[PDB]
From a paper:
[name] is a member of the calcium-regulated gelsolin family of [name] filament severing and capping proteins, a class of proteins found in Asgard archaea and nearly all eukaryotes. In vitro, [name] can nucleate [name] polymerization and bundle filaments.
We successfully crystallized a complex of P. sul [name] bound to three subunits of adenosine 5′-diphosphate (ADP)-Mg2+-[name] (VA3). The resulting structure was refined against 2.7-Å-resolution data and is characterized by R factors of 19.6 (work) and 22.6 (free). Specifically, V1 binds to the barbed-end [name] (A3), and the V1V2 linker extends up this subunit; this facilitates V2V3 domain interactions at the intersection with the longitudinally associated [name] subunit (A1), which represents the pointed end of the [name] nucleus. The HP linker facilitates binding of the HP domain at the junction between A1 and A2. Within this [name]-stabilized [name] nucleus, the V2V3 domains reinforce the interactions of actins A1 and A3, while the V3V4 linker and HP domain stabilize the interactions of A2 with both A1 and A3. Within the [name] trimer, the two longitudinally associated subunits adopt barbed and pointed-end subunit conformations, while the lateral protomer exhibits a monomeric conformation. This provides the first view of an [name]-filament nucleus, revealing that the transition into the filamentous form is stimulated and stabilized by the interactions with the pointed-end subunits.
Numbering used by the authors:
A (entry chain v): 2 to 359, 365 to 751, 755 to 824
B (entry chain p): 4 to 364
C (entry chain f): 4 to 375
D (entry chain g): 4 to 40, 51 to 375
């Protein structure tokens, strides 16, 4: 608390006035209350009692000529006093000739008078002054610098280099007989000055070329202001008259000495430490050092961890050197903190740091590889992580199909029927507590063409704009329908394999005919779908039911693993058949049934498919990729064929067989790490199954009927050219499409253990036999053939540096 | 049954054709040729001009200039020659009989849009016309209404985020770096080996080397080390002269300029940073859908491995819990035009057209 | 005998100096520059990074990065370089000898202040330090204890109402639009005239064009009409290489973004609405004092005509019977620093210094218990 | 101190000497002759032109024939300088935009063939700038087979703006033969080329205004000079005095499509960032024997002033010793005591190979 506020009466009446004087409140003499100086700022406290309620008014008065430090100090101190009195006082800002009535009532005796003048401002005025000087650079080996006492041609000669420092303009004047060494050092000195200041332009001028045409008009006008060219011829000294470069350097070198200001054992001693040459390591951070350059300059180097007495006495002793030696007033003494060394200070040291023996705004991700742990896959997933439906699907929906680049509304009798070759737009309208909300689904068929997908997207936006943009647009790809979309069709959806038109028109066969097969499958009680599949025996799956329409009668085939919900939709579909359904059980297959499917061939039937989820562990699919910068593997629940991407490799867990699906466009490192991860997968499985469970690799397009069975429906028209696995086997062959099994385990083999090939083979670029390490083709030579080619044994070759090995390989064409 | 024309005014290639078609009927360079020595030869007068491939054949006697050098039309007198070549020479059709759908670059100034619509109505007398943003058409070609499109062509690369049909202009990024710069960068690093590609006819074969042997490395530092250890990445190319050259790290150093523009002396950021910055200048609610729909467009997005790399780079800048999906349509060299052919075939376009009567106001 | 240092670290400029001086002795841009090329001349004093005016002088071969972007520090390593440049190069003092008064934006996160305190005590070893709110120092500098400060610098724009020396936090408004956003918008709208400013060095050229020729129009739609009606509002600017560019309507369209943030895609309100909303969040009994004491701070408040336009817009939002007064001090570019020079010069301020012995016994959390 | 060597592998002349000297002690042509149906290098190769086939290993600044280059350096060490290379660190120069493989080959030859204790490679244009004490400026290095425009700012290179023009000295003497032949004389003999080259270096100059100086020659004989051939006959050179150097500004005189040295200088500056063009305008440093024509500095100032904005100060620096400014710059650098840490030692080469020249040198 400010001592000037200590004696303020607390809670009792008073009337006090202070005046701001050099950032401090000074009490005004009581007999002078009412006289305010125009150039000062005051603070007035009026604690008055009124019927038992204490009135506390605080005013700070600002004269019309009061300086900023006083107005600020008055405001700041007003707040201090207000807080010191508990904050109850009310603050008032009073300007001269416009004070409030309450402030004027305090001086109702007509005692309010404005006096002229005021106390001085406490602020120091920053001037930003320029030290214009004329420096000389002269020497033979290391040219030294000296500041001339005045700026005239009389201080210059034609055999040296001179610098005219004018602040932000620097003139380097090269004498007609200056040495090349002096020219180079003066430019370093000039560049050093400019860089220490951050701004400035070096203007190089030659002796004799001090003309407006050679320097520029504005550049010469400034030069002639401080060095008129008309006075040059009379006063400019000559080369010999300027002195010998050797003496000037010899004397200034011995002129330099280094003192030490140290406080050891509490004793301050000034000790001469060394002389020229001087090196930066001579300066210790724990003490202060004085760099004596005599009349040219005195520098005080203060270390970071010096002593306060060392800091003081170092400068006082340096300031004493000026008077003892009676140096001119031009000789200055500068304080140099450690880390703020200027170029001039460094120039006094022959050795400082070291030379520079050897940035892009674009930053490339640097992610180091990590080996993926397979145990994390066995740690079970969070299948129900994100779930959310806005209603129950009982709202209003309008369904449109993309026909002839436009929208055709589907009849209400066809709701729930979609064609896999077309795209649809469904406008869902649901209400919650009377507030209508809209969702625009556009469902894109797997074989829908670009024109139909585009119209579906464009007219989705148009309906959204017809509703003011209030609707939420949802993109839905076939086979990957969200839970709310399925609930709109009461969980039952029929996807006919077909389509219409496409970029003009074609054979838009309208209907599935009379002989078609339906694949009925569901992963829950809500996503039970019936999709049209080819009428072939391989299309059957033991986990699902199938509905076979024919002109003779409709048949329902119930696989061993089918659920009750799957059979119910199959019966309801077959209930529309005027012929009547004839349900069949797997195994109880009459021969007339197979004859309508081309005959019995191998179909999707495995232990995992026949069994119910109650006993077998459900199938799991893992997508492996290094496209994220590191090889990772993630599970896909409710996995279907659309979740397979050709750029990656997948792993399927089917209890008795673990498949490794190889995409055609996948990287080789992704394939190899996916197989190594599959081996680590079952080696860590604590479920107690066979440690040598079959682990086969399956190639994209050559998928067996049991691999496709774990997925939903399978479309051979994507990667198998529409051929079934049997039809592929007939055209290509069993050993042409065989599922090779993964096995453990080359690199780091010895020279003798590597397979050997002739030099005529390894030197070729293309058409090389398999199993040749292209990065170490010299190891594929014999011990004898290596010596003949490389002129040395492989043992001495590997001792040579890596740069020489690569060059030898390039010379011999084995790179 | 009035058929509509769709013309993509590209920085290096004009893609024009008829609406309702699977692909553009004509694709020719966006180059106009004017005589070097006026009057010496027949067909080489002051008012004689040549456009397209014929200007490349007569390159030795023509000057050749790019009208739409950086996505924006700058020379309108040479632009009218391109559209004249499109209607009468390439498509072989009368412009006064067909409504025309034209494409503009992202952030095309209003003045350019007004001079385009004036030239079509007065110089060519089209019945109706409409201009469209190239990125929105590419998005429509992918069956999407929302996504952040990366359109990289010949002279310009643009990032355009779109949500539910409409783009967000304040988040559009622009990079003056594309295939023409990559073609020029391949010539430079090829001459560093001593193969000497400097002439224009040599730049034609260099452009072919770029489109056939270049790829985007997943880890640039690892592939640079692989290319210095063995010739496993080197591939050969046969020049028309029968001479065969070999390229090594130049295969992936050239497209790396898309991610490190400092290779050609540019201070700008890579295509991954401009995509990240474009999504980050959008509302946070829609950022989830933008990271899941990075639709690529343009001929310079055809390098193999560019999708994996864009994912690797974006996934490092995005939150770790983000699902990053890059879409690479197989026909993305013409996604702009295909989207235009779809839009111009919508029957609801008859209300979005700008008739000539409305323009005579 | 210990003279105190005052340092206003801004997002664009750093204003430093000595307590008791009437102005900052060191004003330089808070930029760090790194070379875009390779050095070819061996032993010619090249550096790995350039700071402040030197970076600005050699910006042609540099990429300039601001360590403070949008008022938040993003590169604490480059922030140390700025501070090292301030102490050792500009002020040329030993930081272990001088107490340092630093400034911070209102509602600053305590993580930014605790790291600023740690750097001052562990990297520079200052004897003591103190952090002051920037807006509050500007009000004291104008000789006021009550008012609403509009601090618009290079990174952020704040509206800080203050009553009897204490800010009302519940009414402090923040707009993420300032000088750097105005510079980038001028670069954008200068392309429609044919010019191309892309690099970080060229951005500094546009910033100088903004400071020299931009002004706020009293009526924007009227000046847009007078722009096409003649050429009386067109000016010329000489680029460093001697090229002369001419600008017209861009002179007032650039600062218009302060009143229409939709020009750069921001859906926030203009500076005129953010002050009104800030005044309308205080007690009705103090609003009349605020309306009559709008103090402007920062370089972005230096546009010709911004005070007249500010008073015009607020009068349209405020009651018709309300007296509005916009205070525009001539030195408001340095008003924050001036208030610090006064505060650090008071005799009662020695008690407020957070000393090194206090920091070693309490940790960086001691800075919050002294600046509340 | 171990005396270092400096060798400027010029396109037409090799300038070699000892570090610390003020001028190269050996200046011989960069020509090597072979039997046509053996090795002869330098001036001795040109005394046997009728027997040998003369080739330029460094015709346009870049080294093309390495086996012929190993004999240029062999003639430099053992015949001209009469030194043993294994006892002297050798500084070598390279053209601007020299390929990295070209510099690695130079390092391999110096270490494995000549077994030097240490070596270093410097760019020629950088050494010329160093000789004048500058770190900023655009160099016009106009030599025998190539002319370069190399802008440098604060010791940093701007390689994107380096201009190369394959028109230089030997193009000018050949054009002087062509125009001296077409006035009556006959200079076709290879021995007569050495006489034309002397006429070029002694009587040719650059006109401030070409059209005006041509009109003066058409109405007056004041510009005509005389020259004594070695056989005694005195000839008269007229407008050919300034028509020969004019090719540097009008390359169409010899059928070249390129622009003159003034436009290449201006276009080079305009390829640099806008904030560094002002200093380049005021620091046009000239190097090379082809910049030695009287009047070329005054004419370059006029031509650049017309192309540049009027508010810019154009200055052309024409050092008096600019014919050997590359070597002089190298002689100063290799003599600095702060440079002995920059040398590439043989021990370092054995561990890392020739690619180390890209690390220590730059
Ligand atoms: N397969 C390919 N690989 C690499 N680059 C390609 C390929 N196909 C085309 N390009 C490049 O695409 C560029 C132009 O494509 P385009 O998208 O038509 O450009 P714009 O639309 O901007 O005119 C050309 O520079 C060409 O080099
Ligand atoms: N005369 C002027 N007119 C308009 N803007 C200006 C003017 N002078 C400076 N500025 C802008 O003000 C900013 C500097 O303000 P300052 O108060 O230093 O901000 P900071 O708090 O970031 O230090 C710069 O972005 C500059 O562009
Ligand atoms: N005084 C002169 N006037 C004109 N040309 C000259 C003069 N002196 C030398 N030259 C020319 O300069 C060339 C040599 O220059 P130089 O820089 O050594 O070339 P390089 O470095 O390419 O070997 C020769 O072609 C010679 O004709
Ligand atoms: Ca006073
Ligand atoms: Ca109070
Ligand atoms: Ca001297
Ligand atoms: Ca001590
Ligand atoms: Ca269809
Ligand atoms: Ca919507
Ligand atoms: Ca089932
Ligand atoms: Ca992959
Ligand atoms: Cl102020
Ligand atoms: Mg395009
Ligand atoms: Mg500020
Ligand atoms: Mg040379």
């Amino acid at each position: 608390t400010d001592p000037a506020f200590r004696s303020v009466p607390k809670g009792t009446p008073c009337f006090l006035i202070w005046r701001i004087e050099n950032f401090q409140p000074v009490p005004v003499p009581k007999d002078q209350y009412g006289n305010f100086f125009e150039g000062d700022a005051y603070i007035i406290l009026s604690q008055k009692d009124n019927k038992g309620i204490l009135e506390q008014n605080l005013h700070f008065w600002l004269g019309k000529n009061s300086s900023q430090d006083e107005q600020g100090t008055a405001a700041l101190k007003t707040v201090e006093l207000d807080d010191y009195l508990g904050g109850t006082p009310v603050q008032h800002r009073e300007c001269q000739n416009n004070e409030s009535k309450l402030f004027l009532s305090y001086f109702k005796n007509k005692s309010l008078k404005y006096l002229q003048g005021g106390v001085a401002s406490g602020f120091n005025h920053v001037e930003h002054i320029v030290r214009r000087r004329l420096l000389s650079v002269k020497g033979k080996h290391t040219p030294r610098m000296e500041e001339k006492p005045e700026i005239s041609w009389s201080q210059m000669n034609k055999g040296d280099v001179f610098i005219l420092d004018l602040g932000e303009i620097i003139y380097v004047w090269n004498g007609e007989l200056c040495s090349r060494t002096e020219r180079i050092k003066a430019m370093e000195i000039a560049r050093g000055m400019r860089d220490d200041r951050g701004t400035g332009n070096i203007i190089v001028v030659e002796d004799g070329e001090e003309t407006p045409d050679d320097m520029g008009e504005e550049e010469f006008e400034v030069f002639n202001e401080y060095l008129p060219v008309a006075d040059k011829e009379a006063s400019i000294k000559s080369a010999e008259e300027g002195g010998a470069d050797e003496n000037f350097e010899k004397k200034k070198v011995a002129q330099l000495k280094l003192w030490k200001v140290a406080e050891e054992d509490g004793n301050l001693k000034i000790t001469e430490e060394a002389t020229a040459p001087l090196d930066k390591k001579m300066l210790d951070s724990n003490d202060c050092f004085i760099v004596d350059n005599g009349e040219d300059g005195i520098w005080v180097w203060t270390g970071k961890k010096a002593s306060p007495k060392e800091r003081k006495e170092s400068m006082n002793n340096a300031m004493a050197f000026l008077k003892q030696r009676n140096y001119s007033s031009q000789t200055r003494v500068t304080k140099v903190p450690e880390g703020g060394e200027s170029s001039e200070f460094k120039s006094l040291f022959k050795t400082w740091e070291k030379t520079k023996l050897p940035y892009s705004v674009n930053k490339i991700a640097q992610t180091v590889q990590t080996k993926f742990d397979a145990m994390t896959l066995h740690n079970n997933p969070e299948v129900a992580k994100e779930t959310g439906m806005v209603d129950d699907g009982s709202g209003k929906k309008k369904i449109y199909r993309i026909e002839n680049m436009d929208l055709v509304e589907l009849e209400k009798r066809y709701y729930g029927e979609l064609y896999g070759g077309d795209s649809y737009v469904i406008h869902y309208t649901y209400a919650v507590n009377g507030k209508e909300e809209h969702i625009i689904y556009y469902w894109l068929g797997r074989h829908s063409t670009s024109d139909e997908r585009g119209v579906a997207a464009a007219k989705t936006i148009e309906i959204d704009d017809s509703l003011g943009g209030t609707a939420k647009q949802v993109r839905v790809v076939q086979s990957k329908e969200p839970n709310h979309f399925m609930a709109m069709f009461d969980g039952k959806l029929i996807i006919f394999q077909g389509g219409k038109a496409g970029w003009g028109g074609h054979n838009s066969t309208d209907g599935p005919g009379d002989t078609y097969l339906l694949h009925v499958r569901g992963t829950s009680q809500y996503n039970t779908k019936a999709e049209q599949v080819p009428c072939r025996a391989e299309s059957l799956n033991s986990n699902d039911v199938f509905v076979l329409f024919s002109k003779g009668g409709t048949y329902v085939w119930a696989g061993k693993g089918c659920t009750g919900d799957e059979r119910e939709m199959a019966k309801k579909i077959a209930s529309k058949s005027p012929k009547g359904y004839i349900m069949i059980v797997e195994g109880q297959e009459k021969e007339e049934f197979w004859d309508l499917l081309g005959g019995k061939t191998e179909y999707a039937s495995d232990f995992s498919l026949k069994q119910a989820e109650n006993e077998h562990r459900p199938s799991r699919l893992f997508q492996c990729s290094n496209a994220s910068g590191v090889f990772k593997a993630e599970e896909i629940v409710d996995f279907v064929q659309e979740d397979l991407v050709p750029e990656d490799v997948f792993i399927l867990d089917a209890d008795h067989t673990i498949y490794v699906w190889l995409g055609n466009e996948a990287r080789n490192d992704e394939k190899q790490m996916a197989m190594d991860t599959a081996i680590e997968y079952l080696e860590s499985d604590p479920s107690g199954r066979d440690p040598d469970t079959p682990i086969m690799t399956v190639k994209q397009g050559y998928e067996p009927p049991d691999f496709v069975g774990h997925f939903g429906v399978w479309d051979r028209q994507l990667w198998s050219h529409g051929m079934s696995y049997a039809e592929l086997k007939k055209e290509l062959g069993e050993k042409n499409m065989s599922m090779e099994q993964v096995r453990q385990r080359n690199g780091e083999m010895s020279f003798s253990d590597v397979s050997k090939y002739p030099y005529s083979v390894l030197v070729q670029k293309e058409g090389l036999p398999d199993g040749i390490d292209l990065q170490n083709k010299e190891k594929h030579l014999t011990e004898e053939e290596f010596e003949k080619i490389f002129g040395m044994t492989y043992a001495t070759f590997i001792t040579k540096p890596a740069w020489k090995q690569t060059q030898l390989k390039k010379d011999k064409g084995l790179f | 049954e009035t058929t509509a024309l769709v013309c993509d005014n590209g920085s290096g290639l004009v893609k024009a054709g008829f609406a309702g078609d699977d692909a553009p009927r004509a694709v020719f360079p966006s180059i106009v040729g004017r005589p070097r020595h006026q009057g010496v030869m027949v067909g080489m007068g002051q008012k004689d001009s040549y456009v397209g491939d014929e200007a490349q054949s007569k390159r030795g006697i023509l000057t050749l200039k790019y009208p739409i050098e950086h996505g924006i039309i700058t020379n309108w007198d040479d632009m009218e020659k391109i559209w004249h070549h499109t209607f009468y020479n390439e498509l072989r059709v009368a412009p006064e009989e067909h409504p025309t759908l034209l494409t503009e670059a992202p952030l095309n100034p209003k003045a350019n849009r007004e001079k385009m619509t004036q030239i079509m109505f007065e110089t060519f007398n089209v019945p109706a016309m409409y201009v469209a943003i190239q990125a929105v058409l590419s998005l429509y070609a992918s069956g999407r209404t929302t996504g952040i499109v990366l359109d990289s062509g010949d002279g310009v690369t643009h990032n355009v985020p779109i949500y539910e049909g409409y783009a967000l202009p304040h988040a559009i990024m622009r990079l003056d770096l594309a295939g023409r710069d990559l073609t020029d960068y391949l010539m430079k690093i090829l001459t560093e080996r001593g193969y000497s590609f400097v002439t224009t006819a040599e730049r034609e074969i260099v452009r072919d080397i770029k489109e056939k042997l270049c790829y985007v490395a997943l880890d640039f530092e690892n592939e640079m080390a692989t290319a210095a250890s063995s010739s496993s990445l080197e591939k050969s190319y046969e020049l028309p002269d029968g001479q065969v050259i070999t390229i090594g790290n130049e295969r992936f150093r050239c497209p790396e300029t898309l991610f490190q523009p400092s290779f050609i002396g540019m201070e700008s950021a890579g295509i991954h940073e401009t995509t990240y910055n474009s999504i980050m200048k959008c509302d946070i609610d829609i950022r989830k859908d933008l990271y899941a729909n990075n639709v690529m467009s343009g001929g310079t997005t055809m390098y193999p491995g560019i999708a994996d790399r864009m994912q690797k780079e974006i996934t490092a800048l995005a939150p770790s819990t983000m699902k990053i999906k890059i879409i690479a349509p197989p026909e993305r060299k013409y996604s702009v035009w295909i989207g235009g052919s779809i839009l111009a075939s919508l029957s609801t376009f008859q209300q979005m057209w700008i008739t000539k009567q409305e323009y005579d106001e």
